[PDB]
PDB file of all heavy atoms in Angstrom:
ATOM      1  N   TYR G  80     150.878 126.214 107.364  1.00  0.00           N
ATOM      2  CA  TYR G  80     149.608 126.141 108.087  1.00  0.00           C
ATOM      3  C   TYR G  80     148.736 127.319 107.873  1.00  0.00           C
ATOM      4  O   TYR G  80     147.547 127.233 108.052  1.00  0.00           O
ATOM      5  CB  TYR G  80     149.872 125.741 109.551  1.00  0.00           C
ATOM      6  CG  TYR G  80     150.545 124.426 109.652  1.00  0.00           C
ATOM      7  CD1 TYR G  80     151.105 123.997 110.823  1.00  0.00           C
ATOM      8  CD2 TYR G  80     150.700 123.510 108.591  1.00  0.00           C
ATOM      9  CE1 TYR G  80     151.760 122.772 110.935  1.00  0.00           C
ATOM     10  CE2 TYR G  80     151.345 122.274 108.687  1.00  0.00           C
ATOM     11  CZ  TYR G  80     151.862 121.954 109.859  1.00  0.00           C
ATOM     12  OH  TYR G  80     152.470 120.702 109.953  1.00  0.00           O
ATOM     13  N   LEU G  81     149.342 128.486 107.492  1.00  0.00           N
ATOM     14  CA  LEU G  81     148.488 129.546 106.887  1.00  0.00           C
ATOM     15  C   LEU G  81     147.748 128.999 105.704  1.00  0.00           C
ATOM     16  O   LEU G  81     146.541 129.239 105.570  1.00  0.00           O
ATOM     17  CB  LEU G  81     149.322 130.773 106.587  1.00  0.00           C
ATOM     18  CG  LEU G  81     148.666 131.823 105.662  1.00  0.00           C
ATOM     19  CD1 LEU G  81     147.405 132.367 106.286  1.00  0.00           C
ATOM     20  CD2 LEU G  81     149.599 132.911 105.400  1.00  0.00           C
ATOM     21  N   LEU G  82     148.455 128.346 104.814  1.00  0.00           N
ATOM     22  CA  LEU G  82     147.815 127.718 103.659  1.00  0.00           C
ATOM     23  C   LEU G  82     146.778 126.658 104.091  1.00  0.00           C
ATOM     24  O   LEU G  82     145.631 126.574 103.587  1.00  0.00           O
ATOM     25  CB  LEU G  82     148.864 127.126 102.805  1.00  0.00           C
ATOM     26  CG  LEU G  82     149.534 127.956 101.702  1.00  0.00           C
ATOM     27  CD1 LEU G  82     150.704 127.354 101.164  1.00  0.00           C
ATOM     28  CD2 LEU G  82     148.440 128.312 100.591  1.00  0.00           C
ATOM     29  N   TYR G  83     147.156 125.849 105.050  1.00  0.00           N
ATOM     30  CA  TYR G  83     146.194 124.831 105.617  1.00  0.00           C
ATOM     31  C   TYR G  83     144.862 125.491 106.080  1.00  0.00           C
ATOM     32  O   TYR G  83     143.801 124.985 105.704  1.00  0.00           O
ATOM     33  CB  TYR G  83     146.834 124.086 106.736  1.00  0.00           C
ATOM     34  CG  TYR G  83     145.917 123.049 107.407  1.00  0.00           C
ATOM     35  CD1 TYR G  83     145.826 121.775 106.874  1.00  0.00           C
ATOM     36  CD2 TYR G  83     145.250 123.425 108.566  1.00  0.00           C
ATOM     37  CE1 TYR G  83     144.924 120.885 107.524  1.00  0.00           C
ATOM     38  CE2 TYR G  83     144.402 122.450 109.188  1.00  0.00           C
ATOM     39  CZ  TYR G  83     144.262 121.244 108.622  1.00  0.00           C
ATOM     40  OH  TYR G  83     143.410 120.292 109.239  1.00  0.00           O
ATOM     41  N   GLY G  84     144.970 126.561 106.903  1.00  0.00           N
ATOM     42  CA  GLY G  84     143.788 127.220 107.398  1.00  0.00           C
ATOM     43  C   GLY G  84     143.035 127.867 106.307  1.00  0.00           C
ATOM     44  O   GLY G  84     141.756 127.806 106.240  1.00  0.00           O
ATOM     45  N   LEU G  85     143.689 128.549 105.334  1.00  0.00           N
ATOM     46  CA  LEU G  85     142.971 129.188 104.233  1.00  0.00           C
ATOM     47  C   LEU G  85     142.288 128.146 103.360  1.00  0.00           C
ATOM     48  O   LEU G  85     141.231 128.399 102.788  1.00  0.00           O
ATOM     49  CB  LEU G  85     143.937 130.015 103.347  1.00  0.00           C
ATOM     50  CG  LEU G  85     144.545 131.227 104.018  1.00  0.00           C
ATOM     51  CD1 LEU G  85     145.654 131.867 103.126  1.00  0.00           C
ATOM     52  CD2 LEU G  85     143.524 132.246 104.329  1.00  0.00           C
ATOM     53  N   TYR G  86     142.766 126.951 103.295  1.00  0.00           N
ATOM     54  CA  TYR G  86     142.107 125.928 102.498  1.00  0.00           C
ATOM     55  C   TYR G  86     140.940 125.273 103.270  1.00  0.00           C
ATOM     56  O   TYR G  86     139.823 125.040 102.752  1.00  0.00           O
ATOM     57  CB  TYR G  86     143.093 124.801 102.113  1.00  0.00           C
ATOM     58  CG  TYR G  86     142.538 123.672 101.243  1.00  0.00           C
ATOM     59  CD1 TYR G  86     142.492 123.791  99.851  1.00  0.00           C
ATOM     60  CD2 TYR G  86     141.979 122.618 101.819  1.00  0.00           C
ATOM     61  CE1 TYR G  86     141.964 122.768  99.097  1.00  0.00           C
ATOM     62  CE2 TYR G  86     141.434 121.553 101.057  1.00  0.00           C
ATOM     63  CZ  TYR G  86     141.422 121.623  99.728  1.00  0.00           C
ATOM     64  OH  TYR G  86     140.887 120.629  98.970  1.00  0.00           O
ATOM     65  N   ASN G  87     141.197 125.025 104.577  1.00  0.00           N
ATOM     66  CA  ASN G  87     140.126 124.367 105.383  1.00  0.00           C
ATOM     67  C   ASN G  87     138.924 125.372 105.629  1.00  0.00           C
ATOM     68  O   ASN G  87     137.858 124.899 105.911  1.00  0.00           O
ATOM     69  CB  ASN G  87     140.646 123.889 106.670  1.00  0.00           C
ATOM     70  CG  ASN G  87     141.531 122.668 106.561  1.00  0.00           C
ATOM     71  OD1 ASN G  87     141.017 121.561 106.872  1.00  0.00           O
ATOM     72  ND2 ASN G  87     142.736 122.805 106.096  1.00  0.00           N
ATOM     73  N   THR G  88     139.162 126.622 105.543  1.00  0.00           N
ATOM     74  CA  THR G  88     138.133 127.715 105.723  1.00  0.00           C
ATOM     75  C   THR G  88     137.578 128.159 104.304  1.00  0.00           C
ATOM     76  O   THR G  88     137.268 129.288 104.216  1.00  0.00           O
ATOM     77  CB  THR G  88     138.593 128.864 106.553  1.00  0.00           C
ATOM     78  OG1 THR G  88     139.685 129.524 105.865  1.00  0.00           O
ATOM     79  CG2 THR G  88     139.033 128.377 107.947  1.00  0.00           C
ATOM     80  N   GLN G  89     137.681 127.272 103.350  1.00  0.00           N
ATOM     81  CA  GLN G  89     137.280 127.647 102.009  1.00  0.00           C
ATOM     82  C   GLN G  89     135.794 127.436 101.778  1.00  0.00           C
ATOM     83  O   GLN G  89     135.319 126.352 101.450  1.00  0.00           O
ATOM     84  CB  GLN G  89     138.045 126.784 100.978  1.00  0.00           C
ATOM     85  CG  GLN G  89     137.984 127.277  99.530  1.00  0.00           C
ATOM     86  CD  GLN G  89     138.582 128.617  99.298  1.00  0.00           C
ATOM     87  OE1 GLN G  89     137.968 129.442  98.618  1.00  0.00           O
ATOM     88  NE2 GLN G  89     139.672 128.881  99.884  1.00  0.00           N
ATOM     89  N   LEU G  90     135.029 128.509 101.948  1.00  0.00           N
ATOM     90  CA  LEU G  90     133.585 128.464 101.748  1.00  0.00           C
ATOM     91  C   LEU G  90     133.209 128.733 100.296  1.00  0.00           C
ATOM     92  O   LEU G  90     131.985 128.763 100.047  1.00  0.00           O
ATOM     93  CB  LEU G  90     132.903 129.446 102.698  1.00  0.00           C
ATOM     94  CG  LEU G  90     133.144 129.273 104.220  1.00  0.00           C
ATOM     95  CD1 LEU G  90     132.494 130.391 104.976  1.00  0.00           C
ATOM     96  CD2 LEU G  90     132.599 127.913 104.659  1.00  0.00           C
ATOM     97  N   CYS G  91     134.223 128.936  99.445  1.00  0.00           N
ATOM     98  CA  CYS G  91     133.853 129.228  98.053  1.00  0.00           C
ATOM     99  C   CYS G  91     133.665 128.039  97.178  1.00  0.00           C
ATOM    100  O   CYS G  91     133.959 126.906  97.668  1.00  0.00           O
ATOM    101  CB  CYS G  91     134.955 130.126  97.475  1.00  0.00           C
ATOM    102  SG  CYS G  91     134.410 131.225  96.126  1.00  0.00           S
ATOM    103  N   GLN G  92     133.115 128.182  95.996  1.00  0.00           N
ATOM    104  CA  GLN G  92     132.821 126.993  95.158  1.00  0.00           C
ATOM    105  C   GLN G  92     134.045 126.297  94.480  1.00  0.00           C
ATOM    106  O   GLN G  92     134.006 125.077  94.412  1.00  0.00           O
ATOM    107  CB  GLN G  92     131.807 127.403  94.099  1.00  0.00           C
ATOM    108  CG  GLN G  92     130.511 127.968  94.688  1.00  0.00           C
ATOM    109  CD  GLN G  92     129.522 128.402  93.639  1.00  0.00           C
ATOM    110  OE1 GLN G  92     129.835 128.318  92.450  1.00  0.00           O
ATOM    111  NE2 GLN G  92     128.371 128.978  94.060  1.00  0.00           N
ATOM    112  N   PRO G  93     135.037 127.069  94.078  1.00  0.00           N
ATOM    113  CA  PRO G  93     136.238 126.368  93.481  1.00  0.00           C
ATOM    114  C   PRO G  93     136.856 125.421  94.492  1.00  0.00           C
ATOM    115  O   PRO G  93     137.353 124.373  93.988  1.00  0.00           O
ATOM    116  CB  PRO G  93     137.164 127.501  93.070  1.00  0.00           C
ATOM    117  CG  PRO G  93     136.272 128.595  92.761  1.00  0.00           C
ATOM    118  CD  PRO G  93     135.161 128.525  93.811  1.00  0.00           C
ATOM    119  N   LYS G  94     136.951 125.668  95.765  1.00  0.00           N
ATOM    120  CA  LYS G  94     137.704 124.887  96.698  1.00  0.00           C
ATOM    121  C   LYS G  94     139.144 124.961  96.201  1.00  0.00           C
ATOM    122  O   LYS G  94     139.846 123.935  96.222  1.00  0.00           O
ATOM    123  CB  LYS G  94     137.124 123.486  96.838  1.00  0.00           C
ATOM    124  CG  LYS G  94     136.028 123.332  97.868  1.00  0.00           C
ATOM    125  CD  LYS G  94     136.449 123.583  99.274  1.00  0.00           C
ATOM    126  CE  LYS G  94     137.533 122.623  99.700  1.00  0.00           C
ATOM    127  NZ  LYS G  94     138.072 122.899 101.085  1.00  0.00           N
ATOM    128  N   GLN G  95     139.473 126.089  95.656  1.00  0.00           N
ATOM    129  CA  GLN G  95     140.854 126.259  95.019  1.00  0.00           C
ATOM    130  C   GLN G  95     142.011 125.420  95.638  1.00  0.00           C
ATOM    131  O   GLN G  95     142.331 125.560  96.812  1.00  0.00           O
ATOM    132  CB  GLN G  95     141.162 127.754  95.032  1.00  0.00           C
ATOM    133  CG  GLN G  95     139.939 128.571  95.554  1.00  0.00           C
ATOM    134  CD  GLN G  95     139.776 129.809  94.831  1.00  0.00           C
ATOM    135  OE1 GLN G  95     140.688 130.387  94.219  1.00  0.00           O
ATOM    136  NE2 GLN G  95     138.546 130.390  94.845  1.00  0.00           N
ATOM    137  N   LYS G  96     142.672 124.649  94.759  1.00  0.00           N
ATOM    138  CA  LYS G  96     143.762 123.822  95.187  1.00  0.00           C
ATOM    139  C   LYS G  96     145.063 124.673  95.254  1.00  0.00           C
ATOM    140  O   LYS G  96     145.242 125.572  94.387  1.00  0.00           O
ATOM    141  CB  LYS G  96     143.958 122.615  94.324  1.00  0.00           C
ATOM    142  CG  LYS G  96     143.234 121.354  94.845  1.00  0.00           C
ATOM    143  CD  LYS G  96     141.913 121.122  94.061  1.00  0.00           C
ATOM    144  CE  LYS G  96     142.132 121.329  92.579  1.00  0.00           C
ATOM    145  NZ  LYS G  96     140.802 121.513  91.843  1.00  0.00           N
ATOM    146  N   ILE G  97     145.871 124.436  96.200  1.00  0.00           N
ATOM    147  CA  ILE G  97     147.136 125.160  96.331  1.00  0.00           C
ATOM    148  C   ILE G  97     148.121 124.720  95.292  1.00  0.00           C
ATOM    149  O   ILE G  97     148.311 123.519  94.995  1.00  0.00           O
ATOM    150  CB  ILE G  97     147.759 124.857  97.754  1.00  0.00           C
ATOM    151  CG1 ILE G  97     146.768 125.216  98.822  1.00  0.00           C
ATOM    152  CG2 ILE G  97     149.029 125.645  97.928  1.00  0.00           C
ATOM    153  CD1 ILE G  97     147.134 124.724 100.276  1.00  0.00           C
ATOM    154  N   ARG G  98     148.655 125.743  94.583  1.00  0.00           N
ATOM    155  CA  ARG G  98     149.542 125.511  93.446  1.00  0.00           C
ATOM    156  C   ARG G  98     150.935 125.084  93.940  1.00  0.00           C
ATOM    157  O   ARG G  98     151.447 125.691  94.863  1.00  0.00           O
ATOM    158  CB  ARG G  98     149.607 126.663  92.592  1.00  0.00           C
ATOM    159  CG  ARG G  98     150.128 126.530  91.196  1.00  0.00           C
ATOM    160  CD  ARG G  98     149.983 127.748  90.308  1.00  0.00           C
ATOM    161  NE  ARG G  98     150.387 127.538  88.948  1.00  0.00           N
ATOM    162  CZ  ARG G  98     149.652 127.143  88.006  1.00  0.00           C
ATOM    163  NH1 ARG G  98     148.382 126.795  88.206  1.00  0.00           N
ATOM    164  NH2 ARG G  98     150.142 126.963  86.726  1.00  0.00           N
ATOM    165  N   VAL G  99     151.485 123.970  93.348  1.00  0.00           N
ATOM    166  CA  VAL G  99     152.694 123.355  93.829  1.00  0.00           C
ATOM    167  C   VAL G  99     153.604 123.173  92.553  1.00  0.00           C
ATOM    168  O   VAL G  99     153.085 123.185  91.417  1.00  0.00           O
ATOM    169  CB  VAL G  99     152.429 122.058  94.551  1.00  0.00           C
ATOM    170  CG1 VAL G  99     153.773 121.575  95.219  1.00  0.00           C
ATOM    171  CG2 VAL G  99     151.387 122.264  95.572  1.00  0.00           C
ATOM    172  N   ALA G 100     154.876 123.018  92.787  1.00  0.00           N
ATOM    173  CA  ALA G 100     155.897 122.697  91.743  1.00  0.00           C
ATOM    174  C   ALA G 100     156.089 121.240  91.718  1.00  0.00           C
ATOM    175  O   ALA G 100     155.771 120.468  92.733  1.00  0.00           O
ATOM    176  CB  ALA G 100     157.146 123.524  91.932  1.00  0.00           C
ATOM    177  N   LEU G 101     156.796 120.742  90.711  1.00  0.00           N
ATOM    178  CA  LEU G 101     157.075 119.326  90.598  1.00  0.00           C
ATOM    179  C   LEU G 101     158.058 118.854  91.649  1.00  0.00           C
ATOM    180  O   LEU G 101     157.764 118.003  92.439  1.00  0.00           O
ATOM    181  CB  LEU G 101     157.684 119.054  89.186  1.00  0.00           C
ATOM    182  CG  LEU G 101     157.844 117.594  88.704  1.00  0.00           C
ATOM    183  CD1 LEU G 101     158.876 116.878  89.461  1.00  0.00           C
ATOM    184  CD2 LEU G 101     156.502 116.827  88.902  1.00  0.00           C
ATOM    185  N   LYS G 102     159.254 119.482  91.775  1.00  0.00           N
ATOM    186  CA  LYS G 102     160.225 119.142  92.691  1.00  0.00           C
ATOM    187  C   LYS G 102     159.816 119.460  94.189  1.00  0.00           C
ATOM    188  O   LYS G 102     160.344 118.892  95.076  1.00  0.00           O
ATOM    189  CB  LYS G 102     161.529 119.832  92.331  1.00  0.00           C
ATOM    190  CG  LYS G 102     161.482 121.058  91.602  1.00  0.00           C
ATOM    191  CD  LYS G 102     162.084 120.951  90.228  1.00  0.00           C
ATOM    192  CE  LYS G 102     161.490 121.987  89.246  1.00  0.00           C
ATOM    193  NZ  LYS G 102     160.045 122.106  89.411  1.00  0.00           N
ATOM    194  N   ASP G 103     158.796 120.346  94.233  1.00  0.00           N
ATOM    195  CA  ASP G 103     158.303 120.749  95.528  1.00  0.00           C
ATOM    196  C   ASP G 103     157.725 119.549  96.274  1.00  0.00           C
ATOM    197  O   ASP G 103     157.754 119.364  97.427  1.00  0.00           O
ATOM    198  CB  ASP G 103     157.391 121.856  95.441  1.00  0.00           C
ATOM    199  CG  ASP G 103     157.034 122.460  96.820  1.00  0.00           C
ATOM    200  OD1 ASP G 103     157.111 121.733  97.859  1.00  0.00           O
ATOM    201  OD2 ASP G 103     156.715 123.706  96.824  1.00  0.00           O
ATOM    202  N   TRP G 104     157.122 118.626  95.402  1.00  0.00           N
ATOM    203  CA  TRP G 104     156.488 117.384  96.025  1.00  0.00           C
ATOM    204  C   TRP G 104     157.598 116.523  96.639  1.00  0.00           C
ATOM    205  O   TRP G 104     157.393 116.015  97.802  1.00  0.00           O
ATOM    206  CB  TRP G 104     155.706 116.654  94.976  1.00  0.00           C
ATOM    207  CG  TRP G 104     154.946 115.549  95.555  1.00  0.00           C
ATOM    208  CD1 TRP G 104     155.103 114.170  95.191  1.00  0.00           C
ATOM    209  CD2 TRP G 104     153.884 115.575  96.503  1.00  0.00           C
ATOM    210  NE1 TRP G 104     154.195 113.428  95.991  1.00  0.00           N
ATOM    211  CE2 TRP G 104     153.432 114.274  96.771  1.00  0.00           C
ATOM    212  CE3 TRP G 104     153.338 116.681  97.230  1.00  0.00           C
ATOM    213  CZ2 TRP G 104     152.445 114.035  97.694  1.00  0.00           C
ATOM    214  CZ3 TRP G 104     152.326 116.365  98.106  1.00  0.00           C
ATOM    215  CH2 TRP G 104     151.864 115.077  98.366  1.00  0.00           C
ATOM    216  N   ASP G 105     158.694 116.326  95.955  1.00  0.00           N
ATOM    217  CA  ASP G 105     159.784 115.539  96.521  1.00  0.00           C
ATOM    218  C   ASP G 105     160.377 116.252  97.732  1.00  0.00           C
ATOM    219  O   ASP G 105     160.766 115.593  98.698  1.00  0.00           O
ATOM    220  CB  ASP G 105     160.827 115.212  95.433  1.00  0.00           C
ATOM    221  CG  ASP G 105     162.006 114.440  96.038  1.00  0.00           C
ATOM    222  OD1 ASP G 105     161.810 113.255  96.372  1.00  0.00           O
ATOM    223  OD2 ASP G 105     163.089 115.032  96.151  1.00  0.00           O
ATOM    224  N   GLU G 106     160.401 117.570  97.693  1.00  0.00           N
ATOM    225  CA  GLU G 106     160.913 118.342  98.877  1.00  0.00           C
ATOM    226  C   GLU G 106     160.069 118.078 100.024  1.00  0.00           C
ATOM    227  O   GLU G 106     160.579 117.771 101.143  1.00  0.00           O
ATOM    228  CB  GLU G 106     160.995 119.786  98.433  1.00  0.00           C
ATOM    229  CG  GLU G 106     161.807 120.689  99.418  1.00  0.00           C
ATOM    230  CD  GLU G 106     161.113 120.950 100.729  1.00  0.00           C
ATOM    231  OE1 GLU G 106     159.801 120.915 100.762  1.00  0.00           O
ATOM    232  OE2 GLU G 106     161.751 121.268 101.707  1.00  0.00           O
ATOM    233  N   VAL G 107     158.728 118.174  99.902  1.00  0.00           N
ATOM    234  CA  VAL G 107     157.889 117.954 101.038  1.00  0.00           C
ATOM    235  C   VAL G 107     157.911 116.519 101.498  1.00  0.00           C
ATOM    236  O   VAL G 107     157.689 116.159 102.697  1.00  0.00           O
ATOM    237  CB  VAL G 107     156.407 118.453 100.720  1.00  0.00           C
ATOM    238  CG1 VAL G 107     156.407 119.943 100.560  1.00  0.00           C
ATOM    239  CG2 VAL G 107     155.839 117.641  99.603  1.00  0.00           C
ATOM    240  N   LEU G 108     158.157 115.608 100.521  1.00  0.00           N
ATOM    241  CA  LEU G 108     158.337 114.180 100.950  1.00  0.00           C
ATOM    242  C   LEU G 108     159.500 113.972 101.837  1.00  0.00           C
ATOM    243  O   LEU G 108     159.436 113.270 102.825  1.00  0.00           O
ATOM    244  CB  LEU G 108     158.353 113.325  99.711  1.00  0.00           C
ATOM    245  CG  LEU G 108     158.443 111.842  99.910  1.00  0.00           C
ATOM    246  CD1 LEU G 108     157.314 111.217 100.687  1.00  0.00           C
ATOM    247  CD2 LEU G 108     158.612 111.062  98.598  1.00  0.00           C
ATOM    248  N   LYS G 109     160.689 114.627 101.453  1.00  0.00           N
ATOM    249  CA  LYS G 109     161.830 114.519 102.317  1.00  0.00           C
ATOM    250  C   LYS G 109     161.554 115.200 103.631  1.00  0.00           C
ATOM    251  O   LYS G 109     162.049 114.754 104.678  1.00  0.00           O
ATOM    252  CB  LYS G 109     163.052 115.119 101.552  1.00  0.00           C
ATOM    253  CG  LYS G 109     163.478 114.434 100.324  1.00  0.00           C
ATOM    254  CD  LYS G 109     163.892 113.024 100.561  1.00  0.00           C
ATOM    255  CE  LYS G 109     165.147 112.956 101.471  1.00  0.00           C
ATOM    256  NZ  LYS G 109     166.278 113.796 100.966  1.00  0.00           N
ATOM    257  N   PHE G 110     160.821 116.311 103.596  1.00  0.00           N
ATOM    258  CA  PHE G 110     160.460 116.958 104.834  1.00  0.00           C
ATOM    259  C   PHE G 110     159.589 116.075 105.796  1.00  0.00           C
ATOM    260  O   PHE G 110     159.873 116.006 106.959  1.00  0.00           O
ATOM    261  CB  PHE G 110     159.606 118.255 104.602  1.00  0.00           C
ATOM    262  CG  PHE G 110     159.494 119.174 105.705  1.00  0.00           C
ATOM    263  CD1 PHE G 110     160.497 120.020 106.050  1.00  0.00           C
ATOM    264  CD2 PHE G 110     158.374 119.124 106.505  1.00  0.00           C
ATOM    265  CE1 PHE G 110     160.414 120.923 107.123  1.00  0.00           C
ATOM    266  CE2 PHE G 110     158.224 119.967 107.591  1.00  0.00           C
ATOM    267  CZ  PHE G 110     159.224 120.866 107.885  1.00  0.00           C
ATOM    268  N   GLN G 111     158.721 115.275 105.170  1.00  0.00           N
ATOM    269  CA  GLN G 111     157.974 114.361 105.996  1.00  0.00           C
ATOM    270  C   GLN G 111     158.839 113.216 106.503  1.00  0.00           C
ATOM    271  O   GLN G 111     158.686 112.730 107.603  1.00  0.00           O
ATOM    272  CB  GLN G 111     156.798 113.783 105.170  1.00  0.00           C
ATOM    273  CG  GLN G 111     155.624 114.752 104.987  1.00  0.00           C
ATOM    274  CD  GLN G 111     154.856 115.040 106.280  1.00  0.00           C
ATOM    275  OE1 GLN G 111     155.007 116.069 106.903  1.00  0.00           O
ATOM    276  NE2 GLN G 111     154.102 114.039 106.688  1.00  0.00           N
ATOM    277  N   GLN G 112     159.759 112.739 105.672  1.00  0.00           N
ATOM    278  CA  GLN G 112     160.673 111.676 106.122  1.00  0.00           C
ATOM    279  C   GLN G 112     161.529 112.194 107.253  1.00  0.00           C
ATOM    280  O   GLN G 112     161.782 111.473 108.135  1.00  0.00           O
ATOM    281  CB  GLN G 112     161.642 111.312 104.916  1.00  0.00           C
ATOM    282  CG  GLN G 112     160.890 110.534 103.822  1.00  0.00           C
ATOM    283  CD  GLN G 112     160.268 109.239 104.275  1.00  0.00           C
ATOM    284  OE1 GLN G 112     159.203 108.846 103.794  1.00  0.00           O
ATOM    285  NE2 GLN G 112     160.897 108.581 105.227  1.00  0.00           N
ATOM    286  N   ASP G 113     161.929 113.453 107.276  1.00  0.00           N
ATOM    287  CA  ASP G 113     162.617 114.065 108.368  1.00  0.00           C
ATOM    288  C   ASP G 113     161.673 114.144 109.640  1.00  0.00           C
ATOM    289  O   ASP G 113     162.183 113.793 110.704  1.00  0.00           O
ATOM    290  CB  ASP G 113     163.150 115.398 108.030  1.00  0.00           C
ATOM    291  CG  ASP G 113     164.146 115.963 109.029  1.00  0.00           C
ATOM    292  OD1 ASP G 113     164.012 115.600 110.252  1.00  0.00           O
ATOM    293  OD2 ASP G 113     165.036 116.744 108.604  1.00  0.00           O
ATOM    294  N   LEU G 114     160.471 114.632 109.433  1.00  0.00           N
ATOM    295  CA  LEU G 114     159.587 114.686 110.589  1.00  0.00           C
ATOM    296  C   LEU G 114     159.240 113.317 111.175  1.00  0.00           C
ATOM    297  O   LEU G 114     158.894 113.258 112.405  1.00  0.00           O
ATOM    298  CB  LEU G 114     158.200 115.297 110.144  1.00  0.00           C
ATOM    299  CG  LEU G 114     158.216 116.777 109.555  1.00  0.00           C
ATOM    300  CD1 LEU G 114     156.796 117.346 109.616  1.00  0.00           C
ATOM    301  CD2 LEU G 114     159.218 117.682 110.329  1.00  0.00           C
ATOM    302  N   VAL G 115     159.375 112.281 110.428  1.00  0.00           N
ATOM    303  CA  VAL G 115     159.146 110.940 111.000  1.00  0.00           C
ATOM    304  C   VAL G 115     159.820 110.711 112.318  1.00  0.00           C
ATOM    305  O   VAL G 115     159.351 110.136 113.247  1.00  0.00           O
ATOM    306  CB  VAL G 115     159.493 109.857 109.966  1.00  0.00           C
ATOM    307  CG1 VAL G 115     159.520 108.427 110.570  1.00  0.00           C
ATOM    308  CG2 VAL G 115     158.573 109.884 108.750  1.00  0.00           C
ATOM    309  N   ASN G 116     161.079 111.224 112.388  1.00  0.00           N
ATOM    310  CA  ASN G 116     161.829 111.168 113.656  1.00  0.00           C
ATOM    311  C   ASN G 116     162.230 112.608 113.973  1.00  0.00           C
ATOM    312  O   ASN G 116     163.343 113.078 113.636  1.00  0.00           O
ATOM    313  CB  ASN G 116     163.067 110.321 113.410  1.00  0.00           C
ATOM    314  CG  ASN G 116     163.895 110.661 112.209  1.00  0.00           C
ATOM    315  OD1 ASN G 116     163.624 110.132 111.122  1.00  0.00           O
ATOM    316  ND2 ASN G 116     164.830 111.539 112.400  1.00  0.00           N
ATOM    317  N   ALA G 117     161.386 113.273 114.697  1.00  0.00           N
ATOM    318  CA  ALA G 117     161.680 114.669 115.202  1.00  0.00           C
ATOM    319  C   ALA G 117     160.442 115.066 116.094  1.00  0.00           C
ATOM    320  O   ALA G 117     159.466 114.420 116.169  1.00  0.00           O
ATOM    321  CB  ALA G 117     161.778 115.600 114.015  1.00  0.00           C
ATOM    322  N   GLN G 118     160.639 116.265 116.749  1.00  0.00           N
ATOM    323  CA  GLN G 118     159.681 116.728 117.609  1.00  0.00           C
ATOM    324  C   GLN G 118     158.674 117.658 116.883  1.00  0.00           C
ATOM    325  O   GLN G 118     158.460 118.832 117.107  1.00  0.00           O
ATOM    326  CB  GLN G 118     160.391 117.571 118.740  1.00  0.00           C
ATOM    327  CG  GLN G 118     161.206 118.758 118.261  1.00  0.00           C
ATOM    328  CD  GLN G 118     162.018 119.407 119.382  1.00  0.00           C
ATOM    329  OE1 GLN G 118     163.089 119.874 119.144  1.00  0.00           O
ATOM    330  NE2 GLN G 118     161.412 119.387 120.605  1.00  0.00           N
ATOM    331  N   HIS G 119     158.069 116.999 115.875  1.00  0.00           N
ATOM    332  CA  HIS G 119     157.102 117.637 114.983  1.00  0.00           C
ATOM    333  C   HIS G 119     155.872 116.801 114.850  1.00  0.00           C
ATOM    334  O   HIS G 119     155.338 116.555 113.684  1.00  0.00           O
ATOM    335  CB  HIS G 119     157.731 117.927 113.632  1.00  0.00           C
ATOM    336  CG  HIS G 119     158.899 118.868 113.679  1.00  0.00           C
ATOM    337  ND1 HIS G 119     158.833 120.187 113.191  1.00  0.00           N
ATOM    338  CD2 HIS G 119     160.135 118.751 114.127  1.00  0.00           C
ATOM    339  CE1 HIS G 119     159.983 120.706 113.390  1.00  0.00           C
ATOM    340  NE2 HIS G 119     160.887 119.924 113.978  1.00  0.00           N
TER     341      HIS G 119
END
């Protein structure tokens, strides 16, 4: 959410996208699957 804030407060022209890895996407998908049932 530091990244979230830095992206949402992006007043610059690139609107630079956050760099991610391939397997990182599946990692965050599993993280969301976990959050589906949790105090998050």
